[PDB]
Amino acid sequence: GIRKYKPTTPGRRGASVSDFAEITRSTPEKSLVRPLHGKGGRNAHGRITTRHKGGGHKRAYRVIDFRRHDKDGVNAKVAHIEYDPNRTANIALLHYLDGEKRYIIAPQGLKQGDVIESGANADIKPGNNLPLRNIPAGTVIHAVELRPGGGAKLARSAGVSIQLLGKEGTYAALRMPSGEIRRVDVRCRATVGEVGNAEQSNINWGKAGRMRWKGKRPTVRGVVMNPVDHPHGGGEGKTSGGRHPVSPWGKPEGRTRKPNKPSDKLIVRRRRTGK
Amino acid sequence: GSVIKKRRKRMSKKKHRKLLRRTRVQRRKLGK
Amino acid sequence: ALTAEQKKEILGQYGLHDTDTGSPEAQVALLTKRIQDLTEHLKVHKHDHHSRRGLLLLVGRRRRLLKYVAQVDVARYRSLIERLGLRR
Amino acid sequence: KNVPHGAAHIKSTFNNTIVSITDPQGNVIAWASSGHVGFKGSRKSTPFAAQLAAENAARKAQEHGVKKVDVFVKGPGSGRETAIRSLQAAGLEVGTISDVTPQPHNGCRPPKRRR
Amino acid sequence: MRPYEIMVILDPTLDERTVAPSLETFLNVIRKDGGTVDKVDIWGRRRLAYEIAKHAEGIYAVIDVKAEPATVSELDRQLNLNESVLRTKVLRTDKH
Amino acid sequence: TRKCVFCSKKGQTIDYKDTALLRTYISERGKIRARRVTGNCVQHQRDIAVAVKNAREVALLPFGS
RNA sequence: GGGAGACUGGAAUUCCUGGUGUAGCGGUGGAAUGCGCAGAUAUCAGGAGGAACACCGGUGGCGAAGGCGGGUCUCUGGGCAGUAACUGACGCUGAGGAGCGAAAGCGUGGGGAGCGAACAGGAUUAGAUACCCUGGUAGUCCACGCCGUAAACGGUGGGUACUAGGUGUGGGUUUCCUUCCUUGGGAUCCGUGCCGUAGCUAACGCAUUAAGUACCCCGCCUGGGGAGUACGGCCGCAAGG
Ligand SMILES: [Mg+2]
Ligand SMILES: [Mg+2]
Ligand SMILES: [Mg+2]
Ligand SMILES: [Mg+2]
Ligand SMILES: [Mg+2]
Ligand SMILES: [Mg+2]
Ligand SMILES: [Mg+2]
Ligand SMILES: [Mg+2]
Ligand SMILES: [Mg+2]
Ligand SMILES: [Mg+2]
Ligand SMILES: [Mg+2]
Ligand SMILES: [Mg+2]
Ligand SMILES: [Mg+2]
Ligand SMILES: [Mg+2]
Ligand SMILES: [Mg+2]
Ligand SMILES: [Mg+2]
Ligand SMILES: [Mg+2]
Ligand SMILES: [Mg+2]
Ligand SMILES: [Mg+2]
Ligand SMILES: [Mg+2]
Ligand SMILES: [Mg+2]
Ligand SMILES: [Mg+2]
Ligand SMILES: [Mg+2]
Ligand SMILES: [Mg+2]
Ligand SMILES: [Mg+2]
Ligand SMILES: [Mg+2]
Ligand SMILES: [Mg+2]
Ligand SMILES: [Mg+2]
Ligand SMILES: [Mg+2]
Ligand SMILES: [Mg+2]
Ligand SMILES: [Mg+2]
Ligand SMILES: [Mg+2]
Ligand SMILES: [Mg+2]
Ligand SMILES: [Mg+2]
Ligand SMILES: [Mg+2]
Ligand SMILES: [Mg+2]
Ligand SMILES: [Mg+2]
Ligand SMILES: [Mg+2]
Ligand SMILES: [Mg+2]
Ligand SMILES: [Mg+2]
Ligand SMILES: [Mg+2]
Ligand SMILES: [Mg+2]
Ligand SMILES: [Mg+2]
Ligand SMILES: [Mg+2]
Ligand SMILES: [Mg+2]
Ligand SMILES: [Mg+2]
Ligand SMILES: [Mg+2]
Ligand SMILES: [Zn+2]
């Protein structure tokens, strides 16, 4: 649910926060948490690779399962739904009948006290995982594998979904979340359903702190920059830069995808904006 | 029975509506 | 709608004697039972505006009958109020 | 290719007419239309264009060796009888005549009227 | 406690002899709950007017049951959850 | 105006089972004839319409084959 | 076709996947912008999604007025006829007040197949900011709140008793030619159409469903414009009433 704050202070007017009506617990399994440290936006050399990113809050990482091939044909029951900062969508805790405990992304519409079948011939209940060869055409999926045994590497953020079109030969055509069409080997695995927590878009923050805590720093504009530091800089007053807009390393906008890529001569079509 | 009276009333109402639409901004500035 | 069994037991319990059916006491008892049941219905069903019209008609009839009972007598009116647990 | 039994598909709109000869399984062999015959604009709607299209399609089908066809017709009537008669005269024979016109069951919304 | 009539269509792949035990085990739930009465008649293997679920033939069975609304809704959901059934219709035999 | 066969006390019952009875009241295009042609009363006409269209739903009559 | 909730049915348009297939397809009184030779239209199979339910269906039924029709299940309001067991004048009206109230419009959040204000082009005209053609954003849909207005018309307020007939139609009870099947015939109560006397009306027309002869209560009008406008006040986030 979405909760809206009643205005009582100038900085809090219009702010919002997601009402956690789907959470059950606030304590991850001690046996599955692993440590993590703030990288700070630098790299091995010490330089800043990406500007205006840093600061934040000491987060702990949860190990997620993105293979789902080791355990097959064994049912599992959903235990709890838990908060996860590292990724947008919520996560769920599973108890396998053999006793092992595991984490997975929480699909939309799931709830406590439910049975998830992960077999290669499992049912079409949302949350099941099975190879595309066995999945009927037209259904919706998420967490798709790019190549067999490669791990879930697509459609993971909140509100996203992929639609599976018909089949032919050894390839299946998938609608990307942004309108593209891509082929993939049918041997790979996928999951049925859509990721939950679709109400992320409506969040309105309203306060510079709610961004600084998440770890985004000021942006500083180009036209205010000095001429030496930025190509747009300089000028008496404020000006549009006196030159076509350009990134602050000299290279202008336009083409960005390296041609002759091994997928260039095999993939179908590109994105279209605002049709 | 006829239509002339209705047409006249319609014309007057249209003129008044157009005047209000055009003067909206001045009305708002004066009132507020 | 009320059926024969509950209608008969209400009449037997609230009537002045074993043959009256049109007595104001029986009228009020039947009306209040109907209102209770149908209000319970509208508790779950929200947008039945025709049923709301039914509520209004039944409430008006009950109020008017109670007014007549008050006009004819006072002790009977008070006894009916206390027995049915209403306010007016 | 060679097919003894085939099917004929004819549709006639208010300003065009297209005819195609197809196998019983649905595959097409040859097709003809007024545009291919060589008529442009409003001249395309005359029944004579439909007759020429039907004759050309029948000839091209007889080239592949089609003996009998079944006619499926649809659309508002412009050159129905003329096309059927031209197909008859072209040297082919029809088994059955079936009228299958798409009739919506009060779906969608038609475009507004003309003034 | 009202009279109901139920018609169920079964796919032709099933055997004629095996259907009746399936119906009995389906209606056992009603029989054990509301102390109901029922009568079962079977007559099938007839061509269908139009293609359904990529099938052309089917089995028609008519059932008469006297049970509660909740029990009949239970039966309906249980049947429709099955994969060997095609269609189900339930209606009252009385005036309403 | 011809006579309504169902107002009689000897008239047969109407339901979505009698395939021939339902067929006799529909045109070979698969549609329902008008009450003016049929000659039956309003109640029986509606009962016949409901029965035929229920049978059509339960797949015993074609959708205008 | 009185209302609400749940489940579910097929046709059709669009889109997408996969075969057949060759250069056109769409369009108007006549032509052009448009989509194709990177494979269109057409045709066959499969899939996805949204809205509405031909034939029954009509000057027919229901609701106080707006309005109401794909099927099945659950809850629920009102009316009509008969017997007449019961209460025993408890009836009508209703200033202010409260409730319901077509389509458009506004706030929050979803969904978006078709249609389509605003806006682009194409065409006609001396000028087209239009009628015509190709595209298309709000909106039309759903949930929760708003505003409360229409030729919201039978241009005819509510209740009651009386005043020649005739002919269709819906619903329910009765009796006789009697097959007793039967728009065979007769009596009675309610609803809905058309033609007609006495009567009324300036005339058009109304005529047992009165604009007739009568009684009770409420609203409204006193020459056309100025004006349903100005000021004040109430309501509303805004349009505005
Ligand atoms: Mg660590
Ligand atoms: Mg170094
Ligand atoms: Mg940045
Ligand atoms: Mg620090
Ligand atoms: Mg997250
Ligand atoms: Mg703030
Ligand atoms: Mg900046
Ligand atoms: Mg500076
Ligand atoms: Mg400076
Ligand atoms: Mg420097
Ligand atoms: Mg420089
Ligand atoms: Mg400079
Ligand atoms: Mg400067
Ligand atoms: Mg300057
Ligand atoms: Mg500038
Ligand atoms: Mg630039
Ligand atoms: Mg003037
Ligand atoms: Mg034309
Ligand atoms: Mg058009
Ligand atoms: Mg009936
Ligand atoms: Mg609803
Ligand atoms: Mg194709
Ligand atoms: Mg096609
Ligand atoms: Mg009822
Ligand atoms: Mg008496
Ligand atoms: Mg008043
Ligand atoms: Mg209201
Ligand atoms: Mg609206
Ligand atoms: Mg607006
Ligand atoms: Mg809106
Ligand atoms: Mg919106
Ligand atoms: Mg779409
Ligand atoms: Mg223009
Ligand atoms: Mg359009
Ligand atoms: Mg008005
Ligand atoms: Mg109206
Ligand atoms: Mg009067
Ligand atoms: Mg009458
Ligand atoms: Mg006279
Ligand atoms: Mg006169
Ligand atoms: Mg008259
Ligand atoms: Mg009258
Ligand atoms: Mg007068
Ligand atoms: Mg004056
Ligand atoms: Mg005025
Ligand atoms: Mg005013
Ligand atoms: Mg004022
Ligand atoms: Zn009859």
Swiss-Prot record, chain A:
Region (Disordered): 1-19, 24-57, 222-275
Basic and acidic residues biased stretches: 252-267
Alphabetized SMART domains for the sequence: Ribosomal_L2 (SM01383), Ribosomal_L2_C (SM01382)
Molecular functions (GO terms): rRNA binding; structural constituent of ribosome; transferase activity
Keywords, in A-Z order: Ribonucleoprotein, Ribosomal protein, RNA-binding, rRNA-binding
BP GO terms, sorted: cytoplasmic translation
Stored SUPFAM superfamilies: Nucleic acid-binding proteins, Translation proteins SH3-like domain
Keyword Ribosomal protein: yes
Biased composition (Basic residues): 36-57, 268-275
Gene Ontology CC: one annotated term: large ribosomal subunit
Superkingdom: Bacteria
Subunit annotation: Part of the 50S ribosomal subunit. Forms a bridge to the 30S subunit in the 70S ribosome.
Its job: One of the primary rRNA binding proteins. Required for association of the 30S and 50S subunits to form the 70S ribosome, for tRNA binding and peptide bond formation. It has been suggested to have peptidyltransferase activity; this is somewhat controversial. Makes several contacts with the 16S rRNA in the 70S ribosome.
NCBIfam families: rplB_bact (TIGR01171)
Family under the similarity heading: Belongs to the universal ribosomal protein uL2 family.
Protein name from the UniProt record: Large ribosomal subunit protein uL2
Organism: Mycolicibacterium smegmatis (strain ATCC 700084 / mc(2)155) (Mycobacterium smegmatis)
GN (gene name): rplB
Curated annotation (Swiss-Prot), chain C:
Cross-referenced PROSITE patterns: RIBOSOMAL_S15
GO cellular component: cytosolic small ribosomal subunit
A single MF term (Gene Ontology): structural constituent of ribosome
GO terms of biological process kind: translation
Keyword Magnesium: no
SMART domains: Ribosomal_S15
Keyword RNA-binding: yes
Gene3D superfamilies per the UniProt record, alphabetical: 6.10.250.3130, S15/NS1, RNA-binding
Pfam families hit by this protein: Ribosomal_S15
Keywords carried by this UniProt record: Ribonucleoprotein, Ribosomal protein, RNA-binding, rRNA-binding
Subunit structure: Part of the 30S ribosomal subunit. Forms a bridge to the 50S subunit in the 70S ribosome, contacting the 23S rRNA.
Family: Belongs to the universal ribosomal protein uS15 family.
Purpose: One of the primary rRNA binding proteins, it binds directly to 16S rRNA where it helps nucleate assembly of the platform of the 30S subunit by binding and bridging several RNA helices of the 16S rRNA.
PANTHER family tied to this protein: RIBOSOMAL PROTEIN S15, BACTERIAL AND ORGANELLAR, SMALL RIBOSOMAL SUBUNIT PROTEIN US15M
NCBIfam families according to UniProt: S15_bact (TIGR00952)
Protein name: Small ribosomal subunit protein uS15
UniProtKB/Swiss-Prot annotation, chain D:
Residue numbers spanned by region Disordered: 97-115
Gene Ontology annotations for the cellular component aspect, listed alphabetically: ribonucleoprotein complex; ribosome
Keywords from the UniProt entry: Ribonucleoprotein, Ribosomal protein, RNA-binding, rRNA-binding
UniProt GO MF annotations: rRNA binding; structural constituent of ribosome
Gene Ontology annotations of biological process type: translation
Domain of life: Bacteria
Subunit structure: Part of the 30S ribosomal subunit. Interacts with proteins S7 and S18. Binds to IF-3.
Similarity remark: Belongs to the universal ribosomal protein uS11 family.
Task performed by this protein: Located on the platform of the 30S subunit, it bridges several disparate RNA helices of the 16S rRNA. Forms part of the Shine-Dalgarno cleft in the 70S ribosome.
Descriptive protein name: Small ribosomal subunit protein uS11
Lineage of source species: Bacteria, Bacillati, Actinomycetota, Actinomycetes, Mycobacteriales
Residue range from the parent sequence: 23 to 137 of 138
UniProtKB/Swiss-Prot annotation, chain F:
Subunit composition and interactions: Part of the 30S ribosomal subunit. Forms a tight heterodimer with protein bS6.
Protein name: Small ribosomal subunit protein bS18B
One GO term of the biological process aspect: translation
Gene Ontology molecular-function annotations: small ribosomal subunit rRNA binding; structural constituent of ribosome
GO CC, one annotated term: cytosolic small ribosomal subunit
Portion of the full-length sequence here: 17 to 81 of 84
Similarity field: Belongs to the bacterial ribosomal protein bS18 family.
Function as written in the Swiss-Prot or TrEMBL entry: Binds as a heterodimer with protein bS6 to the central domain of the 16S rRNA, where it helps stabilize the platform of the 30S subunit.
Protein's UniProt keywords contain Metal-binding: no
UniProt keyword annotations, A-Z: Ribonucleoprotein, Ribosomal protein, RNA-binding, rRNA-binding
